[PDB]
Amino acid sequence: DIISVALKRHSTKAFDASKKLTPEQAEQIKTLLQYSPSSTNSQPWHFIVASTEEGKARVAKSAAGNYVFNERKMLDASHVVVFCAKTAMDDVWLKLVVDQEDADGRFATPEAKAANDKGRKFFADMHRKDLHDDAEWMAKQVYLNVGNFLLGVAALGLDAVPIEGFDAAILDAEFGLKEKGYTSLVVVPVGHHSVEDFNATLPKSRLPQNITLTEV
Amino acid sequence: DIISVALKRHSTKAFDASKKLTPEQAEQIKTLLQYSPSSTNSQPWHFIVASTEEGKARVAKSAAGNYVFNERKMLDASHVVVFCAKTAMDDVWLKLVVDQEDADGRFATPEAKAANDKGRKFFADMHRKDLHDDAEWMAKQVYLNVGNFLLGVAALGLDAVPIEGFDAAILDAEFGLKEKGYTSLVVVPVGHHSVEDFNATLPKSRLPQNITLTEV
Numbered sequence: 001d002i003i004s005v006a007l008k009r010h011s012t013k014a015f016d017a018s019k020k021l022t023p024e025q026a027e028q029i030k031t032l033l034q035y036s037p038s039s040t041n042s043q044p045w046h047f048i049v050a051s052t053e054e055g056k057a058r059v060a061k062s063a064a065g066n067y068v069f070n071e072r073k074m075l076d077a078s079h080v081v082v083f084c085a086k087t088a089m090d091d092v093w094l095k096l097v098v099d100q101e102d103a104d105g106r107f108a109t110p111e112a113k114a115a116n117d118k119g120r121k122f123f124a125d126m127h128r129k130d131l132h133d134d135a136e137w138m139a140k141q142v143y144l145n146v147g148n149f150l151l152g153v154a155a156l157g158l159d160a161v162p163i164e165g166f167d168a169a170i171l172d173a174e175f176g177l178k179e180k181g182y183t184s185l186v187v188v189p190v191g192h193h194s195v196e197d198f199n200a201t202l203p204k205s206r207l208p209q210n211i212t213l214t215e216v
Numbered sequence: 217d218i219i220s221v222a223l224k225r226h227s228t229k230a231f232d233a234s235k236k237l238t239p240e241q242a243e244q245i246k247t248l249l250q251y252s253p254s255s256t257n258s259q260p261w262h263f264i265v266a267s268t269e270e271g272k273a274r275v276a277k278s279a280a281g282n283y284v285f286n287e288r289k290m291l292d293a294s295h296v297v298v299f300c301a302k303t304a305m306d307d308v309w310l311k312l313v314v315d316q317e318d319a320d321g322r323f324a325t326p327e328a329k330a331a332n333d334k335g336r337k338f339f340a341d342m343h344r345k346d347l348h349d350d351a352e353w354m355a356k357q358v359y360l361n362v363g364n365f366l367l368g369v370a371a372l373g374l375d376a377v378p379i380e381g382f383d384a385a386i387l388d389a390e391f392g393l394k395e396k397g398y399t400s401l402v403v404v405p406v407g408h409h410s411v412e413d414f415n416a417t418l419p420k421s422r423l424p425q426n427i428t429l430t431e432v
């Protein structure tokens with residue numbers, strides 16, 4: 001390895017449209033989206049996976065105006081993942097999560113399920129009621145998923161780039177997200193880079209650990 | 217392979233204090249922290265890596281009150297990583313970032329360096345001025361780092377648990393973070409699980425893709 005993956009992966013600046021993910025890789029990227037951890041296993045997210053030319057064109061509309069520099073990446077990659085966060089944490093979602101954990105066999109007694117729900121609601125209530133920052137809390141979980149995802153697809157031997165440079169209002173409208181309870185946060189094209197990928201040859205750059213890291 | 221890692225890793229609930237990271241492992245986890253991607257390569261973060269008894273005890277003060285259920289994880293794990301975000305994006309940091317990229321060989325001409333600085337400011341200015349969401353934006357990059365980190369350390373064969381159940385006010389004060397320009401967001405003990413980790417054998421649970429994922 002993973003350290004070689006972390007040291008070798010890069011944000012692809014141009015994708016080769018003739019190179020598609022294998023069907024097995026297309027299944028594997030969905031497994032990575034699904035199985036990321038999240039606070040309280042709340043999983044406050046939705047994913048749009050666009051692999052058709054028609055689907056990628058709808059996403060790529062959000063890369064207009066100042067964001068045109070990202071439009072080619074969304075059009076030319078094999079698959080394009082739109083990471084969305086819930087806009088609100090409702091008690092029906094909270095019920096969905098604890099019932100799924102029960103179906104999966106994580107509770108020995110109904111008292112353990114009850115205690116799991118109560119613990120989750122203490123955190124949800126802290127964010128919804130006391131802090132009124134639940135929207136930001138869930139978005140943070142989505143960014144955590146993205147980070148898991150970017151390392152995972154690199155480890156699969158796939159190129160990708162994370163994109164914030166897009167119009168989320170246009171993307172949300174295009175897919176009806178506001179009415180369904182979600183908002184788009186990061187767009188991640190996945191596929192294979194082309195000869196036009198000028199970043200595929202540049203050395204990686206990071207600030208040194210003597211600036212960013214304190215050992216104690 | 218990385219998919220096996222994603223399906224088999226877990227949030228460790230109790231650590232064996234006698235099982236330390238090897239010397240190479242301690243260096244590798246710092247490489248994972250450093251080499252995470254971030255928007256504009258802004259790297260708006262600081263990490264505290266606690267591996268001494270005193271250092272872990274200091275981090276573990278933050279797991280008081282309602283959060284005692286996370287305190288033993290911090291005391292017992294080999295290393296405890298504190299992920300911090302910058303509290304404001306100042307132009308001295310932006311300069312450090314582009315100068316480092318320059319030092320690493322990423323600009324062919326001074327016009328390319330100047331072009332890189334200009335784009336980074338467009339995004340930094342959009343957040344600090346137009347959106348007034350500067351702290352949230354950098355906090356999102358830290359969560360992305362955490363997501364990368366958790367998958368990396370699992371791929372290294374190390375146990376870990378991300379922790380939000382801590383008092384960031386106490387942790388920030390314990391380490392003088394506010395005055396240094398940072399705030400703590402998530403605590404990640406890393407090491408090896410013990411027999412008391414009730415989560416190491418439980419099946420993993422996630423919502424079905426027919427709820428969370430749309431194909432287009």
Ligand SMILES: Cc1cc2nc3c(=O)[nH]c(=O)nc-3n(C[C@H](O)[C@H](O)[C@H](O)COP(=O)(O)O)c2cc1C
Nearest residue numbers: 037038039040041225226227286378379380381420
């Ligand atoms: C951002 C974040 C914060 C978390 N905080 C805690 C915590 O304070 N205490 C704890 O026991 N687990 C914590 N977890 C562990 C999650 O509950 C766990 O990720 C979730 O149930 C998914 O299970 P898994 O990580 O084993 O796959 C945290 C996870 C995340 C992603």
Ligand SMILES: Cc1cc2nc3c(=O)[nH]c(=O)nc-3n(C[C@H](O)[C@H](O)[C@H](O)COP(=O)(O)O)c2cc1C
Nearest residue numbers: 009010011070162163164165204253254255256257
């Ligand atoms: C238009 C565009 C938008 C980007 N948005 C993001 C983003 O939102 N988050 C992110 O982590 N990286 C983003 N990146 C890539 C980062 O610049 C990149 O991760 C960083 O410079 C480190 O390089 P690496 O990813 O190649 O290691 C974007 C790149 C482009 C071209």
Ligand SMILES: COc1ccc2cc3[n+](cc2c1OC)CCc1cc2c(cc1-3)OCO2
Nearest residue numbers: 038039040041101106107116123380381415
């Ligand atoms: C269904 O089993 C589950 C499912 C989800 C679980 C989630 C958590 N725990 C057990 C869980 C468990 O059972 C072991 C332990 C306490 C905890 C603190 C947290 C957290 C998640 C959890 O995120 C924020 O701080």
